[PDB]
Design a protein around this ligand. Structure first.
Ligand SMILES: [Mg+2]
Ligand SMILES: [Mg+2]
Ligand SMILES: [Mg+2]
Ligand SMILES: [Zn+2]
Lengths: 107, 125, 124
RNA sequence: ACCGGCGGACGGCUCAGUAACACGUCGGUAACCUACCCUCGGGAGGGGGAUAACCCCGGGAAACUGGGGCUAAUCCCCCAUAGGCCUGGGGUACUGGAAGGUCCCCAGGCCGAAAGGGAGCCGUAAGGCUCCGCCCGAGGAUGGGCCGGCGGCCGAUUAGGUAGUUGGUGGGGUAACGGCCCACCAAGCCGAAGAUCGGUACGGGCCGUGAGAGCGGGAGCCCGGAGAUGGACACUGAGACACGGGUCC
């Protein structure tokens, strides 16, 4: 099966209705890539991305980081320290609006 | 009364000072606690955009479906259990997901009576 | 108490007004809206009022009234007191606008000395 | 003049509040509503009812307001049919990056339309012929609701903050997704890369100044937000919790 990203699906199936690979969830919008930094809550991870911001007056750069909370389906089940790919969806809780769709490099 | 606009708390824990009045299009309504009764009773609600909702307040019949695709209209005896609230079963409150007992067996409700106005259930084995 | 009576003959479309006081009016104090009472018992030269032959033992029933300050009587409020409530239609309010509601001062059903006008109709 | 229809939610005014998804920008809604307007496909069958205006009598200092008589509609209410919504079982016709969507066939229910009305000619009459109109479905358009990433103030003589608080499962409610709100199960969430608290302030396109790099401002014109003596809350409507509409303190 393909859901529009053109990447390989997870090996095993699941029963989560909020799983894009095996359930009713639909993805549309941005796609980001990042590193997991927290996995304490059930089915929730925190993903960090780093980028550079240009300071025009001082003609130099500074490093900034963006942290996003993502839904973690049981068929993928990412852990702290690995690279993941996330996609935008409809609101799922107060702070969750993304879902993990692939683990690119296990820790 | 019932305002479904936004929370007054930031995810960090700090407070938010409201910057406007409550708009009319953000209000909710009293829950309908659909009970088991001898005679059925429903009302009509005029909703945003001038649409309608049928609200069921007392239920006496139900539609039960088997795995073969046939259905029967039978009457409801009682609510065996309701995982949504701890004290719904004692008060005989029907919501989606409740287990009801009928004259042909136990059934699990699949519709939302407060939003649709009928009680549909699938037969248990 | 002194009462100003408005008697309407429903079969003709004509009404007459007279003033009644004393033991005659003291009889009427206590009657609600929608109850009958004979006119002969009260005492009124009815055939002279309208100039027409009228049936024997004919009676009348109270339809409404207005108190001494200008507020009317509302059939659905029990007792003789005066209240101030929110209305959307009916006696004591004329809307003029769609869905409008307003707070008005009204009376009850039972007659009392504070009343001045009494509207009744003839019942055969 | 009255009943009835459409409009009065735009336009105009001010900058108190607000350090926030308020605003700028790029995206999303497969999670949503929309009277007026455009195109295509259909429908207009049968009954009932009151009441203002008008006549009789009025009440109150006025603001306002009572009873009886009679009458009409593109006013109101029923019955039918079309139609809509929910759930279970099958089929694979459509769009799309991808179907909790659309389409076809069974089955159990709930809701449930309409004004062939008005004007003008040919009509001997029969009846046409235009003009303006009523209801349902599919789509658009117009006007919005909601969501996300990024961007732009000062203070450490403010260092720890949060307990529906962060997430999960089952529901309710909403036009719609969501701790938006409940019942149960866990211990999460934010922070010296400055949380929390305090100060000051409507945001932007822009404007003043300077060789430039910069520094300072953001009343007047346009686009967005908010308010109608202060604080709370409802009715009607496609749209309001309504500046020249309603209720309480
Ligand atoms: Mg200010
Ligand atoms: Mg019908
Ligand atoms: Mg500023
Ligand atoms: Zn899965």
């Amino acid at each position: 099966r393909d859901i529009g990203l053109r990447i390989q699906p997870p090996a095993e199936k699941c029963d989560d209705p909020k799983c894009p690979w095996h359930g009713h969830l639909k993805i549309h919008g941005r796609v980001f890539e990042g590193i997991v930094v927290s996995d304490k809550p059930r089915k929730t991870v925190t993903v960090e991305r780093q980028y550079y911001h240009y300071l025009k007056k001082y003609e130099r750069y500074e490093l900034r980081r963006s942290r996003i909370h993502a839904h973690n389906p049981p068929c993928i089940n990412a852990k702290v320290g690995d690279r993941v790919l996330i996609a935008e969806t409809r609101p799922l809780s107060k702070t969750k609006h993304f879902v993990v769709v692939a683990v690119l490099e296990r820790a | 009364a019932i305002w479904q606009g936004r929370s007054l708390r930031k995810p960090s824990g700090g407070r938010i000072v409201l910057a406007r009045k409550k708009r009319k299009r953000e209000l909710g309504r009293e829950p309908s606690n659909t009970r088991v009764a001898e005679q059925d009773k429903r009302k009509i609600i005029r909703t945003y955009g001038g649409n309608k909702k049928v609200r069921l307040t007392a239920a006496a019949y139900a539609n039960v479906f088997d795995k073969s695709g046939k259905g029967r209209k039978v009457r409801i005896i009682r609510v065996i259990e309701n995982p949504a609230n701890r004290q719904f079963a004692r008060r005989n409150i029907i919501t989606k997901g409740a287990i009801i007992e009928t004259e042909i067996g136990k059934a699990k409700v699949t519709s939302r009576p407060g939003q649709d106005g009928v009680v549909n259930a699938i037969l248990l084995e | 108490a002194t009462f100003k009576l408005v008697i309407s003959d429903p079969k003709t479309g004509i009404a007459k007004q007279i003033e009644i006081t004393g033991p005659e009016a003291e009889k009427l104090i206590g009657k609600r809206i929608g109850d009958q009472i004979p006119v002969k018992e009260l005492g009124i030269n009815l055939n002279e009022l309208f100039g027409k032959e009228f049936p024997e033992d004919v009676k009348m029933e109270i339809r409404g009234g207005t108190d001494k300050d200008g507020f009317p009587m509302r059939p659905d409020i029990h007792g003789p007191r005066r209240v101030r409530i929110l209305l959307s239609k009916g006696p004591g309010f004329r809307p003029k606008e769609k869905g409008e509601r307003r707070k008005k001062t009204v009376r009850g059903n039972t007659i009392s000395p504070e009343i001045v006008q009494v509207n009744v109709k003839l019942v055969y």
